[PDB]
């Protein structure tokens, strides 16, 4: 259904044979999902610069190599000597091991795409539509919204698909189409036919357009077009394929991959040029062409092993999987590139109400006069858990929960905080939260009595709809409120003339319960209560209570202390004036003290951790608050941003003081601020700009229309769930919680994937470094080349493949969020790490030929033992009076080859353990942190073992099984990759950081 | 232990710490078997001329082909188009299907060597040696006789290993060393030290030498040397490796294999030259080098399939396995080449006593006067089964067995043939046969009474040692022999004065039982017996009995008729002269008739079949007999060599009449003779020579010393078991039975393997013929080449491999021994068969592209249907207004390729059924004759099916699964290989033979 604008509210609906007040059937939803695809853009090709120069380069290596194996193969049939078996075997295995690589490489890749599919269950839904399944509007992915369904559209919403305006439901229907038509003034629409078919978006003021914003109103409609069929999609088609927007890492990796097109080809082509003096040896029949083919294999097969492969897909597995865990704890990050920015964001300019604080008012502590003797008193405090109007909370004592019932005062305390309350609690069947029924400061008195559950009403098996008011609606049936003296500036307090419920007696148990502010009330409290008795309010006692009330408003808490009181013997109502607020000061004097609570707007759950944890990781946090300069600061000292005692009157800000200062002060002050109180709605952008002009990376949260401007500008703009969709469009991350903490749970994750990437390669590079110098070293001095092409391929399958895959399945390093951030322009390899790269290589390659040389040279319980010169070994037949009871041929045997190639594989395995944590010890991050690695190891052990102790199998790779006595030398020479690397950690972690 | 001649009977034995009267231990027998190998020559290399030019030629084809697949493979990475999958797959499969050939080829070969091992259980043993296991001499293979054991050595024996003469056991010890030292006079040895170490065989007249003959005597000794350590072995070392003695077939096969180095390379190199106009087509990207590589694969991969492979080992499996069955029924043929001569031997100059006849005398029929009325009589005959002195025989009546007891006459008949008998039967515990105890003509009277078992003694559970004389030793206790009138020329008869055993009465039951020749006795028979009574011997009755006696000596039987008689009332012994032979004619007159038997020297078991069966197969048989001219002929008319009535007095021979005739008569007469009576011991050679000068192939049997000269000269000299080892050396086949029949059971087998060889290839050639023209035909006319290299390899694995293997596991054709012999110079392929070769090919190749062409052309229930021109198909894009609703690309689809290649495989399978019998119909030799073929078929069906209906698998070979409707067309086009070939049989079998 195209251009449904030419068509009115009847000819439209009937197109898909469907009535607005019903929608489309599930079978139909299928067909349109099948015939029009999804409501999204096409799949862009992720062909990297590494994929061209490295991945496929290998895919040439493996083939020309093989080609060569069939060159020499073919000439074998023309050899006059002995009909061989092992040479004949080679090309078979050549092919049969390279296929094993494909059993690995493609499998890693499939898990990659499986992981991306996994994410497709968390991708944020912002599209309310009417369907046939439910008799009510349903949530659904924007892409998944087929063209035909009655898309619902409200204040601030983002229109996912091209909707023909069917029925206008608000009084007006305007649409901010600044994204396309272009104007910061929205436009009035209507629901009628636009007869002329050829026109511009402007003149179609009877339809929503996919990607436009809702400035105001609410309507309904029908989807004309989706995906590429979209109007903006036809414009966005230009930006789709033709582009050049690689991220910084995506420029490193490949400048890091293309430099290896130099290294690899260079070194290995040189591994040919170095063996020029071995192109007419008798091992190759003294043939000047049959040799050069073989030393074509040595270089190339060493290359294959040298080339790190599987990276493109591994970072997919890593990145994606990390975005899964980000998504799981409500860090909703769409664009995967957003992690690379998410992980270096060193600043978090976030919001307060709903993000740093729960909004929901909550009573902290509250106390009763515990003992009164000698005009002196001890107080009885009771902290309440939780922070919400949901009664999900429990009273305390010294951080030890106890039943308020055990204290008679609290049983009066709640009676005042349940009766003396012109407000209530409610549960929401549609939403599922507890929302206040009145004013929050008074809602907190509903909250509290419920939590305490003084008289212990049975609520464990009582309904949500009864729980929100379980205790209160019991307290209410024990007493009566006869008339309320409303809260009065005069006395900074309220009161209620109560009385015993279900009564027969007239003036026998009426209790004028007061409530409100400290002094105002305490100045009218002449008696003190203890348990169920009374005693004259004393000097030092008064001063104890009021000093402790001074305490909470003094301390970092800053709990709004609210005194509560009782008049014992109330006066006659007939006598009492009922209609003049100023009479109440005579009607509220001479009270009996009961208690004084401390209540506040608490912080959001697990922020108090997510505030210190980030300061450690080199993150500069800022609140964008609405409270006044003073009171905003009190909230930022309540949490942790400011400390109890630490002068900061240079750092707090309000709009007055912000537009005053000269441009530079507005910049200079901004690189050192924490709190933006009463901040005008345009300030947010100017801040960002300034913060950015300090190379600092922003993390703005948002919600109401006028946040997009900042969010779009910042690097990771965030949005609120209850915040509109205009903002979830302009953002990079959507806090599906609203919380500051969930942003942290995101930066901390997005960082983790960065540390796993820097290891997955650290293993490959360092390990494969040694492998090539493992031919240089021996070829330099004269030592034998204790390898053959297949053995060089063997090292590639064993080491580069599966343990590599397990390095991308790693937990978080201990020091995930203590270390400073990466400034995005800092390269992929650092000097000390670059040494650490070649250092680790230096050794794992030196151990390899070592183990081979140890056999010929200083052998234990073995044949030969020639500790003297092994360099000019090719002159052994020239001068034979040097050896002592051993043939010159001995060095062509598979015994040393076994050892070294066994040490080559053995040592790179524990090199992954090293690579488990970039900086934390094997004691600190043991091998069992990663079970997926400890599996990868044993596997290859089975495999590598398997090709030693299966008759024909070793014969294939030219090896020999080893006695117990010999597999011990493997440990003494392989373990040192632990001690070696572990020493590296000690230098970086202590001297280079910390 | 070398040169044990320098050492006497003490210093010798002690060498191996062993005492002559004990020998060597089983553990020692191990060690010497291990340290000195076997007592035989080395293993000669069977490297054929086909192995050089065909087997290994293929082993080059498969490699340069593969090489090519990695040439084009490598350039794929440099192709600008689309990243393919199926081309990338190819080289993998290339290697992976050629390996499948090796799963076949080598497996056929292993069964080959397993079969040869199987024969090593039947190889004839001629070496009696003293060992520790048994306290007596043991039989053992000559090769298996280690050096050390006390080798026993008798009259005529062949000394297997170098024996030091320890203890001379005969009165003299001579040794015929004509084979080495050289002299037809043997040499006296002794048992003492030959002090001078350097000397010639002659001067060591104290030792046996391996390969020399025993002229006379018997001794014992100790083995100095074995195998190459032998003296003749050191001389035979010259004849071992360096030689040139290929058999006629072995010259055909390879002149037949090297001609295919022309055919194969030629045709297939031409299959490249014909596609020169396809080296710049868009299918190959218009590239002038990328194409030529592919049409290198078409030719070569067609070659591979063309080359018949597995033949060298199959003929091993066939030949060997046939030699197994030859060995099983006692045709002991050593040299495997001896079959190739065994199968064309069209003459069988064999022996009589022990070979054509059982030697053992045997009574045929025998009769009683059944009725006597009116001077006339009817006779009651009783044929006896078997032919041996072993009582393994049963009486008959009209070829219906009945108990002689039911006839009273026979109960007297045996009484005369048990009592009147100066001879007996015996069993041999050491040998296990029944050997006579007296003269055979009289032994037959022991034999007979036992067989009859008249009075029915319980013998079913009586010992062998009691059975040989079970009845007789019962008859003997019913009567008494008082004195024997010995057999007398006078009366041509013997008699015994009997009497009732355990008697008290004197002249009351004495019975003078006579025995002997017809007339002599019957002329003294005045009474006749019937049942238990008497009646005067009559004229016509007498003449009935004597005419019937005239009958058996007249008929081809020629049974020595021997009349038996009884004197009822004997005269007084006191009166009777006891000491004058001439008195017995008065003492034997007036007898009572009882019966007259017919007895003879019967033929050997299953000769009467093996005489007619061979005359059919074009075999000219001759007896070398000792009987006189007349009586020798009677034996050769008794069997079948001569017919009842057929004048042959021109064809029978005796030595008198043989050395008389002039050389040419001795030649001219010899190409037409059957019986050589009283033949001087040198005649045998002169015969051979003459028979050979008629291009005829001899099959001389032998036994006594002076047979080797003939046997060595003849083509398949044979030997007797009981015949000495001098003869088992000079022979080519050893009759482990002695029988003429077992020679037949050998020629008939040795022939069978010849017919199986001529089919195993008939399948390959004919089938693979069509395959190559299957590219010529279509390339000639312009049709598409409905194949690709892998498909050409597929045909080679499916068809050439396993069904081929099953063609060598075939039963005997109905017409195994009716058809004439192959004269050894007649080639491997005959004109009509050569047509039949290309005829069958002509069609099985024409069916293949047919089925492909039927798809494009005249299709049923299929897409396309272009019955018009398909030749200039490459001009379809040039001129596109010709097609009707189909793309020009349609012809590159896998649909026709599937069909044809499916017909290519389908039709060659039933081509093996054809090949089951060279000339006998599917009705005559149904497919279920060979279960090993009917297995081979289903297998490949599973395989071929499997690569159509397994998603990726067909995609690999570029094929498509077929609907039921389509696998029906396969039958209608494949079955005709039956009807086609079956018509060939009808022409050859009837018009060209029969
Ligand atoms: Ca690699
Ligand atoms: Ca590696
Ligand atoms: Ca073949
Ligand atoms: Ca074939
Ligand atoms: Na942004
Ligand atoms: Na011979």
Residues A652 and A667: their CA atoms lie apart, in Å, by 14
Residues β-bridged to residue A434: A427
Contacts of A394 (CB under 8 A, 6+ apart): A384, A385, A386, A401, A451
Cα dist from B373 to A517, B369, B408, whole Å: 165, 11, 18
Taking contacts as CB-CB distances below 8 angstroms, the residues of chain A near B56 are 77
C-alpha span between A444 and A442 (Å, rounded): 5
Euclidean distance between CA atoms A444 and A425, whole angstroms: 9
Contact A74 B91 (CB under 8 A): no
* A237 and A249 housed in the same domain: no
B256 and B230 in one domain?
A: no
Please list the residues that pair with A220 across neighbouring strands: A167
What is the Å distance from ligand 2's center to A796 Cα?
6
Q: Six-digit token pair at A74? A: 């073919």
Q: How far apart are CA A242 and CA A239, in angstroms?
A: 6
- Cβ neighbours, 10 Å, residue A966: 18
Task: Kindly state whether residues B597 and B607 are assigned to the same domain.
Answer: no
**Domains in chain A, number:** 4
Contact state of B66 with A70 under an 8 Å Cβ cutoff: yes
Q: How many CA atoms lie within 13 A of A189 on its CB side?
A: 32
Integer Cα distance of A116 and A110 in angstroms = 10
The number of beta carbons lying within 10 Å of the beta carbon of residue A224 is 26
CA of A831 to the centre of ligand 1 (A): 24
Distances in Å between the alpha carbon of A138 and those of A145, A430, B614? 11, 13, 99
- Residues of A with catalytic roles: 351
Contact B621, B743 (CB under 8 A): no
DSSP B304-329: HHHS--SHHHHHHHHHHHHHHHHHHT
Neighbours of A61 (CB within 10 A): 24
CB contacts of A71 in chain B (<8 Å) are 67
Nearest residue to A994 via CA among A985, A851, B985: A985
Instruction: From B119, B609, B557, select the one nearest B323 (Cα to Cα).
Output: B119
**Per-residue tokens: A511:** 């209790």
SS3 assignment, position A524: coil
Phi, psi at A259, each rounded to 5°? -65, -30
Q: What is the DSSP string of B352-383?
A: SBTTTB--S-EEEEEEEEEEEETTEEEEE---
Contact indicator for A223, A173 with CB cutoff of 8 Å: no
**Tokens matching residue B694:** 């008629």
User: Which residues of A, range 601-640, sit inside 8 Å of B by Cβ?
Assistant: none
Give contacts of A 896-915 with B, CB under 8 A. Answer: none
What is the distance between the alpha carbons of residues B641 and B658, in angstroms, rounded to a whole number?
20
Three-state DSSP class for B775? helix
Backbone angles phi, psi at A524, to 5 degrees: -115, 20
Beta bridge partners of B427: B434
Query: Rg of chain B over CA atoms, in angstroms?
Result: 38
Parallel/antiparallel/unpaired status of strands B362-373 and B591-600 = antiparallel
Domain boundary among B539, B573, B602: B602
Enumerate the β-bridge partners of residue A447.
none
Cβ proximity of A689 and A708 under 8 Å: no
CA-nearest of B847, B653, B717 to B769 is B847
Q: How many CB atoms lie within 10 A of CB B19?
A: 10
Identify the helix (H) or strand (E) that includes residue B595: strand B591-600
DSSP A369-428: EEEEETTEEEEE---B---SSSS---B-STT----GGG-HHHHHHHHHHHHS-S-EEEE-
What's the CA gap between B609 and B607, in Å, rounded? 5
Could you give the dihedral angle defined by the CA atoms of residues A956, A957, A963 and A969, in that order, rounded to the nearest 10 degrees?
180
Q: Which helix (H) or strand (E) holds B249?
A: helix B248-258
**Chains A–B, number of C-beta pairs less than 8 Å apart:** 42
Segment (H or E) for A238 = helix A231-240
Are B214 and B728 a contacting pair, CB within 8 Å?
A: no
The experimental method is: electron diffraction
Task: Kindly report the length of chain B.
Answer: 994
**Cβ count near A500 (within 10 Å):** 14
The answer on whether B684 is annotated among ligand-binding residues is yes
Residue with tokens 């040189």: A270
CA gap A438, A422 in Å, rounded = 7
Q: Are A413 and A594 in contact (CB under 8 A)?
A: yes
| Contact between A92 and B92 using a beta-carbon 8 Å cutoff | no
- Token pair, residue A838, equals 């070649």
Bridge partner list, A219: A153, A168
For tokens 């007398």, what's the residue? B488
Structure tokens at B110: 């292993």
Tokens coding A209:
């357009």
| Residues B288 and B237 reside in one and the same domain | no
Instruction: Enter the DSSP assignment of A696.
Output: -
Q: Classify burial at A662, counting beta carbons within 10 Å of its beta carbon; exposed 0-12, middle 13-18, buried 19 or more.
A: exposed
Distance in Å, alpha carbon of B276 to nearest chain A alpha carbon: 25
Task: Give the Cα-Cα-Cα angle B204, B209, B211 (nearest 5 degrees).
Answer: 150
Beta partners for B426?
B435
Contacts 24+ apart (CB under 8 A), B176-179: B176/B212, B176/B213, B176/B214, B176/B215, B176/B726, B177/B201, B177/B202, B177/B209, B177/B212, B177/B213, B178/B213, B179/B211, B179/B212, B179/B213, B179/B232
B516 and B576 both lie in a single domain: yes
Q: How far is CA A452 from CA A595, A806, A846, B158, B608, in A?
A: 15, 51, 71, 120, 122
Q: Give the integer Cα–Cα distance in Å for B347 and B349.
A: 6
Ramachandran area for residue B350 (φ above 0: left; ψ -120 to 50: alpha; else beta): beta
DSSP for A448-495, written as a single string = HHHHHTTT----TTS-HHHHTTTTHHHHTTTEEEEEEEEEEGGGTEEE
The residue behind tokens 């907190």 is A444
- Are A68 and A198 in the same domain? no
Give the dihedral sign, CA A452/A457/A459/A464.
negative
Angstrom distance (rounded) from CA A875 to CA A281 = 12
Structure tokens at B727: 């003869």
Helices (H) then strands (E): counts for chain A = 33, 23
Which strand (E) or helix (H) includes residue B654? strand B652-654
Q: Which two tokens stand for residue A946?
A: 């398997």
Mark whether B542 and B489 lie in a shared domain: yes
Counting ligands in written order, the one closest to the CA of A911 is 2
**Under 8 Å between Cβ of B154 and B218:** yes
Q: Can you tell me whether residue B335 is helix, strand or coil?
A: coil
Nearest partner of B365 among B403, B416, B410, judged by Cα: B410
Cβ count within 10 A of residue B586: 11
Q: Per DSSP, what are the bridge partners of residue A513?
A: A496, A566
Contacts of B64 in chain A (CB under 8 A): 74
- Count of alpha carbons within 13 Å of A169, Cβ hemisphere only? 11
Distance of CA B700 to the CA centre of its chain: 16
Neighbours of A908 (CB within 10 A): 29
Sequence-ordered strand ranges (E) for A659-790: 675-677, 718-720, 733-735
**Structure-token pair, residue B12:** 């010798």
Q: How far is CA A871 from CA A299, A773, A777, A868, in A?
A: 21, 17, 12, 9
Q: What is the CATH number of the domain that holds A19?
A: 2.70.150.10
CATH of the domain at B351: 3.40.50.1000
For residue B228, the SS3 value is: helix
SS3 state of residue A436: strand
Considering every ligand atom shown, identify the ligand nearest to the alpha carbon of residue B768 and give its number: 4
CB atoms within 10 A of CB B441: 15
The reported resolution of this PDB entry, expressed in Å, is: 3.4
Measure CB to CB from residue A60 to each of B66, B77, B92 and give the nearest one.
Answer: B77
CB A425 within 8 A of CB A447: yes
End position of a domain, from candidates B701, B716, B745: B745
Supply the DSSP string of A829-875, one letter for each residue: S-HHHHHHHHHHHHHHHHHHHHHHHHHHSS-SSSS----S--TTGGG
Q: A310: phi > 0 → left, psi -120 to 50 → alpha, else beta; which?
A: left
Closest Cα partner for A765 from A48, A51, A54, A49? A54
Spatial separation of the C-alpha atoms in residues B424 and B473, rounded to whole Å: 10
Pairing outcome for strands A129-130 and A620-624? unpaired
CB atoms B66 and A67 under 8 Å: no
Let me know whether B770 and B906 are in one domain.
yes
Give the Cα separation of B381 and B409 in Å (integer): 11
SS3 content of chain B, % helix, strand, coil (to 5): 45, 15, 40
Domain C-terminal end among A581, A602, A623: A602
| Catalytic residue annotation of B | 351
**CA B393/CA B387 separation, integer angstroms:** 8
CB contact under 8 A, A71 and B67: yes
DSSP string, B847-870: HHHHHHHHHHSS-SSSS----S--
The CA-atom distances, in angstroms, between B364 and each of B232, B389, B527, B600 are 53, 13, 25, 7
**A524 CA distance to ligand 1 centroid (A)?**
85
A929 CB-near residues (< 8 Å, 6+ apart) = A810, A811, A916, A917
User: Dihedral sign, CA of A737, A741, A743, A745?
Assistant: negative
> What is the distance between the alpha carbons of residues B594 and A596, in angstroms, rounded to a whole number?
155
Q: Residue A424 maps to which CATH number?
A: 3.40.1110.10
Terminal Cα distance for chain B, rounded? 63
B255 and B228 in a common domain? no
Within 13 Å and on the Cβ side, how many CA atoms surround A178?
13
Examine the domain organization and report whether B765 and B904 are in the same domain. yes
User: Which residues in chain B are contacts of A99 at CB distance < 8 A?
Assistant: 92
Q: Between the CA atoms of B554, B555, B560 and B565, what dihedral angle is there, to the nearest 10 degrees?
A: -80
With beta carbons less than 8 A apart as the criterion, state whether A439 and A423 touch. Answer: yes
| Coil/strand/helix, residue B3 | coil
B328 is known to lie in a ligand binding site = no
Gap from CA of A85 to ligand 2 centroid (Å): 29
| Shortest CA gap B70–chain A (Å) | 5
Distance between Cα A307 and ligand 1 center (Å): 4
**Of the candidates A866, A897, A907, which has an alpha carbon nearest to the alpha carbon of residue A960?**
A897
DSSP A708-737: HHHHHHSSS-EEESSS-HHHHHH-SEEESS
Q: Is B647 exposed, middle or buried (0-12, 13-18, 19+ CB in 10 A)?
A: exposed
Q: Which domain holds residue B465?
A: 359-602
CA angle A805, A807, A809 (to 5 degrees): 85
Query: Based on the number of CB atoms within 10 Å of its own CB, is B531 exposed (0-12), middle (13-18) or buried (19 or more)?
Result: middle
Count helices and strands in chain B by DSSP H and E runs:
33, 23
Same domain, A523 and A656: no
> Which residues in chain B precede a discontinuity of more than 2.5 Å between C and N?
none
Using only C-alpha atoms, chain A has a radius of gyration, in whole angstroms, of 38
Q: Taking the CA atoms of A287, A293, A295 and A297 in sequence, report the sign of the dihedral they define.
A: negative
Confirm or deny that B515 is annotated as ligand binding. yes
The label of the residue with tokens 């400011």 reads A642
Q: Smallest Cα–Cα separation from B796: which of B766, B771, B761?
A: B771
Do residues B711 and B338 touch, judged by C-beta distance below 8 A? no
- 3-class secondary structure, B735: strand
Which tokens is A109 given?
């890749």
| A595, A618: one domain | no
Q: How far apart are CA B728 and CA B180, in angstroms?
A: 18
């Amino acid at each position: 259904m195209e251009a449904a604008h030419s068509k009115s509210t009847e000819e439209c609906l009937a197109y898909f044979g469907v009535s607005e007040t019903t929608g489309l059937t599930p079978d139909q939803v299928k067909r349109h999902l099948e015939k029009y695809g999804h409501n999204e853009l096409p799949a862009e090709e992720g062909k990297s610069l590494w994929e061209l120069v490295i991945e496929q380069f290998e895919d040439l290596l493996v083939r020309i190599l093989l080609l060569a194996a069939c060159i020499s193969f073919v000439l074998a049939w023309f050899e006059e000597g002995e009909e061989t078996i092992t040479a004949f075997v080679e090309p078979f295995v050549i092919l049969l091991i390279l296929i094993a690589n494909a059993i690995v490489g493609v499998w890693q890749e499939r898990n990659a795409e499986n992981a991306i599919e996994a994410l497709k269950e968390y991708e944020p839904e912002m599209g309310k539509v009417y369907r046939a399944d439910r008799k009510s509007v349903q949530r659904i992915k924007a892409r998944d919204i087929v063209p035909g369904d009655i898309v619902e559209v409200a204040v601030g919403d983002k229109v996912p698909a091209d909707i023909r305006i069917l029925s206008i439901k608000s009084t007006t229907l305007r649409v901010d189409q600044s994204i396309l038509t272009g104007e910061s003034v929205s436009v009035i629409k209507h629901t009628e036919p636009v007869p002329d078919p050829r026109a511009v978006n402007q003149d179609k003021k009877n339809m929503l357009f996919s990607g436009t914003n809702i400035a105001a109103g609410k309507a309904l409609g029908i989807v004309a077009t989706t995906g590429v069929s979209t109007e903006i999609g036809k414009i966005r088609d230009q930006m789709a394929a033709t582009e050049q927007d690689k991220t910084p890492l995506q420029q490193k990796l490949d400048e890091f991959g293309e430099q290896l097109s130099k290294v690899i080809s260079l070194i290995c082509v040189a591994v040919w040029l170095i063996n020029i003096g071995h192109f007419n040896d008798p091992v190759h029949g003294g043939s000047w062409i049959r040799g050069a083919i073989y030393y074509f294999k040595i270089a190339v097969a060493l290359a294959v092993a040298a080339i790190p492969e599987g990276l493109p897909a591994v970072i997919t597995t890593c990145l994606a999987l990390g975005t899964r865990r980000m998504a799981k704890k409500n860090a909703i990050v769409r664009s995967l590139p957003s992690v690379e920015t998410l992980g270096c964001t060193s600043v978090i300019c976030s919001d307060k109400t709903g993000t740093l604080t729960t909004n929901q008012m909550s009573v902290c502590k509250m106390f009763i006069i515990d003992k009164v003797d000698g005009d002196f008193c001890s107080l009885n405090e009771f902290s309440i858990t939780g922070s919400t109007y949901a009664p999900e909370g429990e009273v305390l004592k010294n951080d030890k929960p106890i039943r308020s019932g055990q204290f008679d005062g609290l049983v009066e305390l709640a009676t005042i905080c349940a009766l003396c309350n012109d407000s209530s609690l409610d549960f929401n069947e549609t939403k599922g939260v507890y929302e206040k029924v009145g004013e929050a400061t008074e809602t907190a008195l509903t909250t509290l009595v419920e939590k305490m559950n003084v008289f212990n009403t049975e609520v464990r098996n009582l309904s949500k709809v009864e729980r929100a008011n379980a205790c209160n609606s019991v307290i209410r049936q024990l007493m009566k409120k006869e008339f309320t003296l409303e809260f009065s500036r005069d006395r900074k307090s309220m009161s209620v003339y109560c009385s015993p419920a279900k009564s027969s007696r007239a003036a026998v148990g009426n209790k004028m319960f007061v409530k409100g502010a400290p002094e105002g009330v305490i100045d009218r409290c002449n008696y003190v209560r203890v348990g169920t008795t009374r005693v004259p309010m004393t000097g030092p006692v008064k001063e104890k209570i009021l000093s402790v009330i001074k305490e909470w408003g003094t301390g970092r808490d800053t709990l709004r202390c609210l005194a509560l009181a009782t008049r014992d013997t109330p006066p006659k109502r007939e006598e009492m004036v009922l209609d003049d607020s100023s009479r109440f000061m005579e009607y509220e004097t001479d009270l009996t003290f009961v208690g004084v609570v401390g209540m506040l707007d608490p912080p959001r759950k697990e922020v108090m951790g997510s505030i210190q944890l980030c300061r450690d990781a080199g993150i500069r946090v800022i609140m964008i608050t609405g409270d006044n300069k003073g009171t905003a600061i009190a909230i930022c000292r309540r949490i942790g941003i400011f400390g109890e005692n630490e002068e900061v009157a240079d750092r707090a800000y309000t709009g007055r003081e912000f537009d005053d200062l000269p441009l530079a002060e507005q910049r200079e002050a901004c690189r050192r601020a924490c709190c933006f109180a009463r901040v005008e709605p345009s300030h947010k952008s100017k801040i960002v700009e300034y913060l950015q002009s300090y190379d600092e990376i922003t993390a703005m949260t948002g919600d109401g229309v006028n946040d997009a401007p900042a969010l779009k500008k910042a690097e990771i703009g965030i949005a609120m769930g209850s915040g509109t969709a205009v903002a979830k469009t302009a953002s990079e991350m959507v806090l599906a919680d609203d919380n500051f903490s969930t942003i942290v749970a995101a930066v901390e994750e997005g960082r983790a994937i960065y540390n796993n990437m820097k290891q997955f390669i650290r293993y490959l590079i360092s390990s494969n470094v040694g492998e090539v110098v493992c031919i240089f070293l021996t070829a330099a001095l004269g030592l034998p080349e204790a390898l053959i092409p297949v053995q060089l391929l063997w090292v590639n399958l064993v080491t580069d493949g599966l343990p590599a895959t397990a390095l991308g399945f790693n937990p978080p390093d201990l020091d995930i969020m203590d270390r400073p951030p990466r400034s995005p322009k800092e390269p992929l390899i650092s000097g000390w790490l670059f040494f650490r790269y070649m250092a680790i290589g230096g050794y794992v390659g030196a151990a390899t030929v070592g183990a081979a040389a140890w056999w010929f040279m200083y052998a234990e319980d073995g044949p030969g033992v020639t500790y003297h010169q092994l360099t000019h070994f090719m002159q052994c037949t020239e001068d034979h009076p040097h050896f002592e009871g051993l043939d010159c041929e001995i060095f062509e045997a598979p015994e040393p080859m076994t050892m070294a190639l066994s040490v080559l594989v053995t040592i790179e395995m524990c090199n992954a353990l090293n690579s488990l944590s970039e900086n934390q010890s094997l004691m600190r991050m043991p091998p069992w942190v990663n079970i997926w690695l400890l599996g990868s190891i044993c596997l290859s052990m089975s495999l590598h073992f398997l090709i030693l102790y299966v008759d024909p199998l070793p014969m294939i790779f030219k090896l020999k099984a080893l006695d117990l006595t010999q597999w011990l030398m493997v440990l003494k020479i392989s373990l040192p990759v632990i001690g070696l690397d572990e020493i590296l950690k000690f230098i970086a972690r202590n001297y280079l950081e910390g």
